[PDB]
Write a protein that binds this ligand. Structure first.
Ligand SMILES: Cc1cc2nc3c(=O)[nH]c(=O)nc-3n(C[C@H](O)[C@H](O)[C@H](O)COP(=O)(O)OP(=O)(O)OC[C@H]3O[C@@H](n4cnc5c(N)ncnc54)[C@H](O)[C@@H]3O)c2cc1C
Ligand SMILES: Cc1cc2nc3c(=O)[nH]c(=O)nc-3n(C[C@H](O)[C@H](O)[C@H](O)COP(=O)(O)OP(=O)(O)OC[C@H]3O[C@@H](n4cnc5c(N)ncnc54)[C@H](O)[C@@H]3O)c2cc1C
Ligand SMILES: Cc1ncc(C[n+]2csc(CCOP(=O)(O)OP(=O)(O)O)c2C)c(N)n1
Ligand SMILES: Cc1ncc(C[n+]2csc(CCOP(=O)(O)OP(=O)(O)O)c2C)c(N)n1
Ligand SMILES: COC1=C(OC)C(=O)C(C)=CC1=O
Ligand SMILES: COC1=C(OC)C(=O)C(C)=CC1=O
Ligand SMILES: COC1=C(OC)C(=O)C(C)=CC1=O
Ligand SMILES: COC1=C(OC)C(=O)C(C)=CC1=O
Ligand SMILES: [Mg+2]
Ligand SMILES: [Mg+2]
Ligand SMILES: [Mg+2]
Lengths: 594, 594, 198
C-alpha cells in the first residue's frame, strides 16, 4: 500500500494502471531517474530509437495500430523535446494521442541558462492538448492522470509532460492500490438528433455515407458497416476512414478527393444528392472547393468536437457525438424504420454506383522497363493477403498506393494524412509491429521519405522487429517535380548521382541495398516487372528466417505523373485509364482477396 | 529600376543585397514560388538536404564558419517548419543567426484546417528573435530587411519567415536599386567604463581573462590576443571562445569547466584572484556552483546584452558593449597605461600558470587493443595541420576531443555548445565546407550521433563536398552510460547486435563502412592503434581523388570513463593522468604545430 | 561609489539617471519595498491615483505632453497589473511609451496560486515592447536599462517590469556613478532615398 518512493516510481505505477506496456525513447542525463524507475518497476518494454524523431513516430504507429493504445515517447531535456514537435503536430493533426515525456533542468535553474534547458512548454502548446512542466513531485501522478483523461476524451490529441530532474528524484508518499484512472468524457447524440438524420436520409434519393477517421477513432467500424447495410447506402471512406468497411463490400463506393481518390468515387460523390458525414471533417484535399462539393446536396455532419461543425462548410444538420454512440443509435432507429416499412429500396442507385466502380479504372498492368509504379501496387495486391496492414506517408509513392492498393479492415491503412512528415514511414511501421507482433505489416516509401530516418532500420535489426518495406525509387522528389509543372520548372528535386561504389545503380545515387544491409537488415533490388512477385516471395522467406526488416527496392522510371487535380470534376489522367479487368486486374470487382 | 514582379522575386533581390549566396533546403508545393524565383534570379547556390533538419543544421555550420555569414534554410509548410525548431533552438542558444524560410497555406485558409497548415509562428517564437507570417506581398521585402537587422544586431539570433502561398505569387512594384540594408545596432563601452576595468585589472595580482563566444561573434580575436599580450594576462577561452588565442600561445592557459576542460585550466582558475570576462556568459558547465567559482575573485563581465549581466552571478563590474568596441578601447587604454609605466610585471603568475600547463596532463599514448579513444585524438593532432577546423556536437567523443585536440584560429572549433543536438555534426560540417571550400574540415562523432542524420553523407556525395569524418565507435551511448553510474544502472544505452551481414563488426551492430559506401562516400575501418595514422593518410588521398566525404571509423573498447565532475575542484580522473610528454606527446608545450 | 543596497534602491538611481521625476500609482503590500526606496531616495514626485487605470492613463498623458517624457505607473501584484492592460494597449497602439512597474509574489511561490499572483508577463506581452518578471536582484538595474532603450528606440512602445517581492528587497552591490543609459537606435534615410523622394 502506502509508501515513500520517488516521484518517478509513482509514475511507473500510474503508467501501469493506465495500460502502458511499451515505450520508445532515447535516454539522457536529465531523464535518467525516470529510466531508473522504469528498470526497477519492470513490465514496460523499452525500444531504443536511433533518432528522437524516430521514437516519437514509433509512438504514433503504436497508437494508431490498435484501439485504446497510447504510444509513449521518452527523451531528455533540450533538443530531445524540440525533436518531438513534428510528431506532436502529426498526432494533433489526425486527432490521435501520444504521450511524450521529457527530462528538464532542475526548477531553480529554469530561468538561468542551464545547459540544454529550453521552454518546451511554450514550444509544444500549439500542437498538444496539454504541455506542462511539472513543478512539484506530488503532482507527477496527477499530471499523468489528467494527461490520460485528455488523451482519451473529446477530440483526442497528444500530451507532453516535462519533468525537472529534482522533481523526478524527490520523495512522495504514494499508494498504488488507491490510484484510479479518471472517467473518459464523450458526448452522445440524442434520439431526437438521430431521428432527424434518418428522416433526412430517407428523403434523399442518391445518398452516400462519408465515413471518416472518427469512426475508426471510436472503434465503431462494425456498426458503420451494419448501418450502411440496413439502409443500403453506399459508403465513401475518407483517407482516414479507409478500412472501416472492406474494399470488396458491395456498398464500398471508392474514395473521393483531389489525389488519394478513385475516378468512380469522385463521379459517385458528384452524382449524389446527400452526404451523410460520420466522424469526418471536410478536408480540403477531400472536397476541393466546398461550393462544388456541396452543390445540390444536403450535408449531415456528426463530429465529437463542436467547433469542427461548420468550420469549413455549413451542414444542413450538425450533431455533436462520439461516432460509436451515434452509430449505436443510428442502427436502432434504422431497425425501427425497417420494421415500419419506411426505408426506401435503393437498388438503382447502388447499381449505378457499382457500374461506375466497374468501368472508371486506371491501368496497373505495365510490362515496361524501367518499371511503372502502378505495376508495383498490382503486385502488392496479389502477393499479400487480405490481412495486410499498409503503412505509408506522402509522395507519388503514397498517392498512387492509395489509388491502387486495397484494404479490408480498420487500422490496416496507417497514414499521417493531415501532416505528412517525411521519414514517418519506417518508425511508424516499427511502432505498429511493436503493438502487434502478429500484424502483417507492409510499408510503402519513395526514396526520399526512406532516406530521412533510414537509420531506424537498425532499430528493427537490433530488436528483431520484422516487416516488409516496399521502396519505389525514382531518384526524384517525385511529388514536388509534378507540382513544379505549374512553374515550367524541374528544379532542386533530383537525387541522382554516379555512385562511386555502385555502378550497378546506374546513376540513381544512393545504393539502398548496401545501406539497408549495413544497418543489419535484408534487401532485394528489382529492375524488371516480372521479378517483383518473386521478390515479394523471397522477402517473406528472408523475414521468417532472419526476423529483421526486409527492404524490396523497385527501380522505377524517373518520371511518372500520377492522376490528380484541383477539383473533384477536374482530376487529370496523365497515364492510361482502363475500363476492363485486363489492364486493372486487382480491382475487387475482378479479384477475390483471400 | 522600378518594375512589377512577384513578391518572391523582390525577395531574391533583397537576399542578394544582404549578401546571401547559398541556401540549404527541401522544396515542396507551398514553397515552389520561392524556388521558382530563386531559379529565375540565379546567384544563389542551393544545396538539397536529405532531411529538413539536415538543411537547418547546414545553415548553422555555414553561419558559424565565417564572420558575417548567414546560413539560409528553406522548407515547405507544415512538418518542414516543425523540423526546423531544433536548429532555431541551437542557434538561439549560442547567439548566432540562421534565416529559416517556410511556405504556408494561403491566408484565407489559415484557420480552416488546410493540408499541412500549422501555427509555426507560435511554435517558433520562444527560439527565435522574430517569427512572423507575412500577411501582405509588399511586406515580404520589409520583413526580410528587419530580419537581417535582427540577425546582426544586439545579441544575434535566428529568424523564421513564413510565406503564405498567395502572398508569394502576388505582384508588387519593387525597385532593387533603391533597397538598402538597415544599420546594425551595437552598443559600445565608454572610456569611463573601460578605464575602471583596466584599473581593476592592474590591482589584481593573479588575473585571468575568460574569452567567450562573444569575442568570436564580434570578429575580435586579434584584438583579444593583443590585449592579453599588452597586459601579460593569461587567457582561458570558454568552449565557445576556443581558438580566439592560439593553443600554443604562451598566454593560453587552458579551458575551464566540469567536462570540456583541462586539469591545468581549472587549477589556474581556482588560483586566480580576478576573472576578466569578455563576451562570455557564465555557463553552468563552465562554472560549477557559482559560489565556488567566484570565491576570492573580483569578476568583470563585458556583454553586448544587458540582461545577460547578473543573470547567473553578480559581477563586481558589468559593462554593456560589443566585444570589438570594448577590446578596441581596452587596447588603447592599456597602451596609455604602458607608456605611463602603470602595467605591473606578471612574470611569476604567468610562470605559475605555464608550470601547471606542463605538469597537469592526461595520458593519450595508449597501445591498447581495442583502441582507447584518447589515442585517437593524439593521432588527429599529428595527422592534421595547424589550420584544421574541427566540427563536433556531444558525447564522450566530443568531451574527450575538447580535452585533447588543439586548435589555432577562431572558428576552427565549430560546436553547438549550449543545445548539443545529436545528428548536428554531419550537416554542420557540410555547411562549413559550403562556406569555405578551402577549409580543412575534420568532424568528430560517436556512433549514435553519426546515425541520427547519417543520410546527409549522400548530400556530400551528390554535391561533391569533401571533408574527413572521424567516427569513434563504442556501440554505446557512452556519455549516458557514464551518467548512469550514479544510478548503479547500465540500461537502454547499448547499440550492439550481431550484424547478419557483417560478422567482421564482431557484434558492434551497424556496419558504418557499408552504410557510408552505400550513401556514395568512402570509408575506412581501424581496429589497431598503429593503423590510425595510416588511415588518416589514406583518407586525405581518397578525398583528393573522389571529392566526397571520407569516414574513418575507429573501433573503440566498449567502456571508457572520461574525466568529469560536478565542481572545478572535484573533476575525477578515471583514466591514467600524465606529468611527462611521453604519455601526452601532443600538448603544445611538447609539439610544434606546423 | 559602489555600495550595498536593496535592488529597489539601485532601481531608484537608475530611474533618476534616466530622467524620471514623477510617478503615478497605487501602493500595495507587494510593491511596498519600491515605495520605501522611492521615499528614501527622494526626487520622484508621487501622485496617488483613485483607480489603477487612472494612474496608467496619467502616465500616458505625461509621456504625450513633452518630447522625451516617460510616464511611470506603479501598482501592486494581481489585479493592479490587469488594471493596466488598457493603457499598455493605448500606449502601444499610438507608438508612445509608458513604464509600468508591478509588485509580484516571491519567486518560490509563483506557481503555487499565492494570493494575488497572476501571470502578468503573458497577459501584457501582446501590448508591450517588453513585459518581464525580473528573476534576480542583480538584473533589476539591467532590465530597467533595457526598458529605457526599448521605449526610446525604433517605433516607441511601453514596457511592463514585474518585481517579485524577494527580488526587490535582496541586497546587491551597485555603483550609481558607473551607470550609463544605453544608446538609442534610430535608423536614418540616406541621401539617395531623399533625393528620389524630392
Ligand atoms: C498527399 C496527400 C493526399 C491526400 N489526398 C486526399 C484525398 O484525395 N481525399 C481525402 O479524403 N483525403 C486525402 N488525404 C488525407 C487528407 O489530408 C485528410 O487527412 C483526410 O481527408 C481527413 O479525413 P477525415 O475527414 O476523416 O478527418 P480526420 O482527421 O480523421 O478527423 C475527422 C474528425 O473526427 C473527429 N473525431 C475524433 N474522434 C471522434 C469520435 N470518437 N467520434 C466522432 N468524431 C471523432 C475529429 O474531431 C475530426 O473533426 C491526403 C493526404 C495526403 C498527405
Ligand atoms: C557535453 C558538453 C560539455 C561542456 N563542458 C563545458 C566545460 O567544461 N566548460 C565550458 O566552458 N563549456 C562547456 N561546454 C559548453 C557550455 O555549455 C557553453 O556552451 C559555453 O560554456 C558558453 O560559452 P560562453 O560563456 O562563451 O557563451 P556564449 O553562448 O558563446 O555567449 C556568451 C555571451 O556572448 C554575448 N555576445 C554575443 N555577441 C556579442 C558581441 N558582439 N559582443 C559581446 N558579447 C556578445 C551573448 O550575449 C552571450 O551572453 C560544454 C558543452 C557540452 C555540450
Ligand atoms: C519534412 C517535409 N519536408 C518536405 C515535404 C514535402 N514533400 C512531400 S512529398 C516530397 C517528396 C517525396 O519524395 P519520395 O519520398 O522519393 O517520393 P516520390 O514522390 O518520388 O514517389 C516532399 C519533399 C514534407 N512532406 N515533409
Ligand atoms: C536529440 C538528443 N537526444 C538525446 C541527447 C542526449 N545525449 C547526449 S550524448 C548521448 C549519447 C551519444 O553517443 P555517441 O554519439 O555514440 O557518443 P559516445 O558518448 O558513446 O562517445 C545522448 C543520448 C541529445 N544530446 N540530443
Ligand atoms: C537537384 O539537384 C540540384 C543540382 O544538381 C542537378 C544543382 O546543380 C543545383 C544548383 C540545385 C539542385 O537542387
Ligand atoms: C457481383 O459482384 C460484383 C459487385 O457487387 C454486386 C460490384 O459492385 C462490382 C463492381 C463487380 C462484381 O463482380
Ligand atoms: C540497450 O538495449 C536494450 C535491450 O537490449 C540489451 C533490452 O533488452 C531492453 C528491455 C531495453 C534496451 O534499451
Ligand atoms: C618554452 O616554451 C614553452 C612555454 O612557454 C614559455 C610553456 O608555457 C610550456 C608549458 C612548455 C614550453 O615548451
Ligand atoms: Mg536520418
Ligand atoms: Mg522519389
Ligand atoms: Mg557511442
Amino acid at each position: 500500500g502506502m509508501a515513500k518512493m520517488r516521484a518517478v516510481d509513482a509514475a511507473m505505477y500510474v503508467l501501469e494502471k493506465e495500460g502502458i506496456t511499451t515505450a520508445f525513447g532515447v535516454p539522457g542525463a536529465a531523464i535518467n531517474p525516470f529510466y531508473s524507475a522504469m528498470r526497477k518497476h519492470g513490465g514496460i518494454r523499452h525500444i531504443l530509437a536511433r533518432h528522437v524523431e524516430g521514437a516519437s513516430h514509433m509512438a504514433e504507429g503504436y497508437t494508431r495500430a490498435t484501439a485504446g493504445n497510447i504510444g509513449v515517447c521518452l527523451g531528455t531535456s533540450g533538443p530531445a523535446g524540440t525533436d518531438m514537435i513534428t510528431a506532436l503536430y502529426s498526432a494533433s493533426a489526425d486527432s490521435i494521442p501520444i504521450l511524450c515525456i521529457t527530462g528538464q533542468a532542475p526548477r531553480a535553474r529554469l530561468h538561468k541558462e542551464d545547459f540544454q534547458a529550453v521552454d518546451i512548454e511554450a514550444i509544444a502548446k500549439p500542437v498538444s492538448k496539454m504541455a506542462v512542466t511539472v513543478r512539484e513531485a506530488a503532482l507527477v501522478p496527477r499530471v499523468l492522470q489528467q494527461a490520460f483523461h485528455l488523451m482519451r476524451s473529446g477530440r483526442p490529441g497528444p500530451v507532453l509532460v516535462d519533468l525537472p530532474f529534482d522533481v523526478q528524484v524527490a520523495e512522495i508518499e504514494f499508494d498504488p492500490d488507491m490510484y484510479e484512472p479518471l472517467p473518459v468524457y464523450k458526448p452522445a447524440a440524442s434520439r431526437m438528433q438521430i431521428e432527424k438524420a434518418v428522416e433526412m436520409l430517407i428523403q434523399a434519393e442518391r445518398p452516400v455515407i462519408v465515413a471518416g477517421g472518427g469512426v475508426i477513432n471510436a472503434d465503431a467500424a462494425a456498426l458503420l458497416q451494419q448501418f450502411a447495410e440496413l439502409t443500403s447506402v453506399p459508403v465513401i471512406p475518407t483517407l482516414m476512414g479507409w478500412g472501416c468497411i472492406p474494399d470488396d463490400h458491395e456498398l464500398m463506393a471508392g474514395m473521393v478527393g483531389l489525389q488519394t481518390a478513385h475516378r468512380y468515387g469522385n463521379a459517385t460523390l458528384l452524382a449524389s444528392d446527400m452526404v451523410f458525414g460520420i466522424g469526418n471533417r471536410f478536408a480540403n484535399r477531400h472536397t476541393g472547393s466546398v461550393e462544388k462539393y456541396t452543390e445540390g446536396r444536403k450535408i449531415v455532419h456528426i463530429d465529437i468536437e463542436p467547433t469542427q461543425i461548420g468550420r469549413v462548410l455549413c451542414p444542413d444538420l450538425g450533431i455533436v457525438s462520439d461516432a460509436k454512440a451515434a452509430l449505436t443509435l443510428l442502427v436502432e432507429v434504422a431497425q425501427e424504420m425497417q420494421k415500419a416499412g419506411r426505408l426506401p429500396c435503393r437498388k438503382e442507385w447502388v447499381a449505378d454506383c457499382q457500374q461506375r466502380k466497374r468501368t472508371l479504372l486506371r491501368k496497373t498492368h505495365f510490362d515496361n522497363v524501367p518499371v511503372k509504379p502502378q505495376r508495383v501496387y498490382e503486385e502488392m495486391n496479389k502477393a499479400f493477403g487480405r490481412d495486410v496492414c499498409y503503412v505509408t506517408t506522402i509522395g507519388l509513392s503514397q498517392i498512387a498506393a492509395a489509388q491502387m492498393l486495397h484494404v479490408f479492415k480498420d487500422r490496416h491503412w496507417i497514414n499521417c494524412g493531415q501532416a505528412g512528415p517525411l521519414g514517418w514511414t519506417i518508425p511508424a511501421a516499427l511502432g505498429v509491429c511493436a503493438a502487434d507482433p502478429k500484424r502483417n505489416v507492409v510499408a510503402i516509401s519513395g526514396d526520399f521519405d526512406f532516406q530521412f530516418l533510414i537509420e531506424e532500420l537498425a532499430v528493427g535489426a537490433q530488436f528483431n522487429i520484422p516487416y516488409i518495406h516496399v521502396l519505389v525509387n525514382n531518384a526524384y522528389l517525385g511529388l514536388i517535380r509534378q507540382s513544379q509543372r505549374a512553374f515550367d520548372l524541374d528544379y532542386c528535386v533530383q537525387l541522382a548521382f554516379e555512385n562511386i561504389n555502385s555502378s550497378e545503380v546506374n546513376g540513381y545515387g544512393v545504393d539502398h541495398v548496401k545501406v539497408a544491409e549495413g544497418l543489419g537488415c535484408k534487401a532485394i533490388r528489382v529492375f524488371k516487372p516480372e521479378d517483383i512477385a518473386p521478390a515479394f516471395e523471397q522477402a517473406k522467406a528472408l523475414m521468417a528466417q532472419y526476423r529483421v526488416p526486409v527492404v524490396v527496392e523497385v527501380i522505377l522510371e524517373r518520371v511518372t505523373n500520377i492522376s490528380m487535380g484541383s477539383e473533384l470534376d477536374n482530376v487529370m489522367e496523365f497515364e492510361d485509364i482502363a475500363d476492363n479487368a485486363a489492364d486493372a486486374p486487382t480491382e475487387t470487382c475482378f479479384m477475390h482477396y483471400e
